[PDB]
Amino acid sequence: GRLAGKAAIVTGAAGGIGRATVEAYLREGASVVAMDLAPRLAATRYEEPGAIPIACDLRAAIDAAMADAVARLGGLDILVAGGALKGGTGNFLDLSDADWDRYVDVNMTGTFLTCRAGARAMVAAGARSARIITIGSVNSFMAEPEAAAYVAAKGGVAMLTRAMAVDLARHGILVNMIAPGPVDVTGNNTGYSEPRLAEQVLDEVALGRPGLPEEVATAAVFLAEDGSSFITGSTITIDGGLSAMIFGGMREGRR
Amino acid sequence: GRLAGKAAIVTGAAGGIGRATVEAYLREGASVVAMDLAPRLAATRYEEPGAIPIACDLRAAIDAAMADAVARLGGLDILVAGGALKGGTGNFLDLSDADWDRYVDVNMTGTFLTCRAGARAMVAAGARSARIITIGSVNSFMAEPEAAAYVAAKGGVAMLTRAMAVDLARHGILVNMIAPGPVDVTGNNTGYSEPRLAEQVLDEVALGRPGLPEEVATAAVFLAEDGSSFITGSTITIDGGLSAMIFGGMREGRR
Amino acid sequence: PGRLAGKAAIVTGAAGGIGRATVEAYLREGASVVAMDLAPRLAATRYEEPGAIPIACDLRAAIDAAMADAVARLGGLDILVAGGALKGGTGNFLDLSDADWDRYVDVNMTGTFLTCRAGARAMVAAGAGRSARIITIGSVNSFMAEPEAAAYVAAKGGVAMLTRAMAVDLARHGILVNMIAPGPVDVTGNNTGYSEPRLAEQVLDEVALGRPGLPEEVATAAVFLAEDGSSFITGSTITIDGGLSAMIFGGMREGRR
Amino acid sequence: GRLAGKAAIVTGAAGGIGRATVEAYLREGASVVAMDLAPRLAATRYEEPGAIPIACDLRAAIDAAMADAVARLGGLDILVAGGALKGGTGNFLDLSDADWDRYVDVNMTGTFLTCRAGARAMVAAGARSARIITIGSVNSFMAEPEAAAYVAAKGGVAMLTRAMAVDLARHGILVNMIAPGPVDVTGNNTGYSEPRLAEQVLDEVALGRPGLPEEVATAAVFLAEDGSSFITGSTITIDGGLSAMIFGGMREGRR
């Protein structure tokens, strides 16, 4: 197994990409803590056995859950910070303080708090480099409409990732971001089925479809394995060509 | 004058780039509110006359100052959001919750609150497009060492800028970021004079020196004037070639 | 006084939309301007502003001759705008011929290289460094690909990186180098660019401002990058695309869906 | 094996990264054609057995070699376009037509001719998606001094890659670039040993060293395997943090 004997924590582990990451990590031989909200963990089944469920809430709760997790693993080699709120609010003109605060607090500050706690535990455990992997978005670089808080926080996560890579290189830790495009988490191909939205996926994604969580999780394996030892401060974009293309609606097969 | 008769608010107006922006705006014919901390405004002189000083503190204070400012101008055509904390903390491993919160609250949330208030006033005043200009940094794209909170917040400002451009285009407002590199604000050539730091500026900046605030303010004029009517969601980088170059220390004249 | 008062400028592709608008803006801001393009195209252009010095050229011996000719007539060289460019699509990459590849790479990339090297050499001979200024015209296609135009797209990437490389090497010689990256620009003069129905719909979806730009909206950046106040700007790109490169899923936005 | 039963062509296969790619591909179960100059192939030994040597010269020679290669494999699933001239010339002012032409012809046009031939053979063979992997550089995005031709051609390769991704998505082919930073190909740690250069590697690369060819080859495996099915038009950067960091010489441990 490519991750044989490594200790990993995956946050947002009841969500689409987080769940798929837990499963891929278990198949590749890692010992894995799956962290998410207690009720969400309660309602998840993993396709692979061995996951250690640990409830958490994206500051005291994060430190508690992380200490708990590291205690149970006896170390920490890989952290995947996948806890995240994804959603739009409306136009910027009408964006409330409460929606701004929730996205910034949960996506940005939550990622900061998890990663600091994890980096500290990796150094305490003797960090072969340890690995921190952040889940950003194509929205870390280009903005969707009517989601300014989510978008801003994703830019914050992208730069937080680069800053961490710079500061933790001396401590034996590599840090990188995965930037997914549209991903269908429903499990029954009903994500992106609204007609206007489906048309726009066909126009804007060169592969003409949303991704599956498993197509994202594979990058999480790649960035955690021993062979990725010169990769840090970088982004792996997994978006079917979305960020590579302009005027995709004009292409042969679409127009 | 290129800005003749336009109403402008400049935040961070007692700081280097903000002060230089107030002056350039006044010379190009604008009516200008200069906003900053009361004690800092108290201790500033502008080289050009006509600035309307309005004290503020980077939420209730921002809304009060902005209403006050728009009342005094009788409209709002241009906002420059330059209020910002610039500084490093230490290594990411040791970054406290308090330093994280201060940079994120002041640089990111402060910019959000100022821009929402300003966009709302521009629409109420009948937004030729109105203009919002944000002051980010090269640190919005690449990380300096030991400044993870500042760096993260600058990434958040960059993406906030793009999200605003997308959402406010329908409301007649263009939104862009200025990304300065090293800028000497001291006024007496003593910024970047520490020997190791001076050597690194020579290596990393193709022009081999820090910029002056006035070399940044000129972009703020350009992005506010009528001719810039197709420019939105973009960044103007003003860094002497810093972000364009790698292994600059190996170039002819340096090695 | 005029923001460019008393500066000598060469504008290539000067009979084309953006080049023509650049000549005009430069003349209005007080520059002495050589307009370079193909002889027959210069023959068929009128400038809205007087004072342009026409010099025929063909985007290697032709370029060196025209550039020496141009510098001779201006008595110096302070600003070069390299706007000569072929813009067009070919078809799918699978079917792209050697001849179309060679034409776009030779004209857009090698032509820009040859013009800029000759210009930089003349700026140094004339005593650059106030810095001399080289401005290249790239495209949003320097960074993101349109369909069925792989040769044009590749060459635009080459121009973007040539620009950065020139900025690094010519900083010591007193020359600043930057790129302008336009999105869709209507050069027709009668609002018929981007009128094809499917294309019009896609401009509404992908450009936040919901329309193509005008050449004059690009030329303004050429003034900005050539003036004395832009003295710390080099190796950078000014993007002028109505929010095209900033936005994804623009067709879903309020007012469009 | 992650590439079990796939047919691959690797160009520049006697060079550092190309050699390491051939070896990784053979270990992961692929049938591999190694293409390079005849004399260079003559003087290479692969650490893994099974490589099919095919001499070529980076237009008629490329078409001949490619047809030859596809004939011997009985198909084509993966192309790695690694043939490339790497070198600096001097200052831009003094760059000759001959050096410009050589870098543009070999790096850019050579990559174009190889990839068109390969894409055509992949479609003829019934392209699970086929995979084209280009080897660019950090110089595809940021310029090193005194190498303008090399740099320009690397920017051309980057955009050629994105254009191919857009056009070939409908034909079942995913296209991505690997962007290495400094890589020691010498085999005896003498790459980057010149004192001034060694000091600049320490400053500019967060990991503080050059990479090894094997640290690049691992990305070529990742981008060729079935699980990477939603990745196209993207770049994997493998540079020890070089492109992520500014003022790296000022970091703790360096200053």
Ligand SMILES: OC[C@H]1O[C@H](O)[C@@H](O)[C@@H](O)[C@@H]1O
């Ligand atoms: O289809 C992808 C494409 O969407 C757009 O039109 C652009 O804004 C790009 O940012 C992106 O690459």
Ligand SMILES: OC[C@H]1O[C@H](O)[C@@H](O)[C@@H](O)[C@@H]1O
């Ligand atoms: O020139 C300084 C240099 O710092 C680095 O090595 C890179 O990240 C570049 O972006 C930058 O230009």
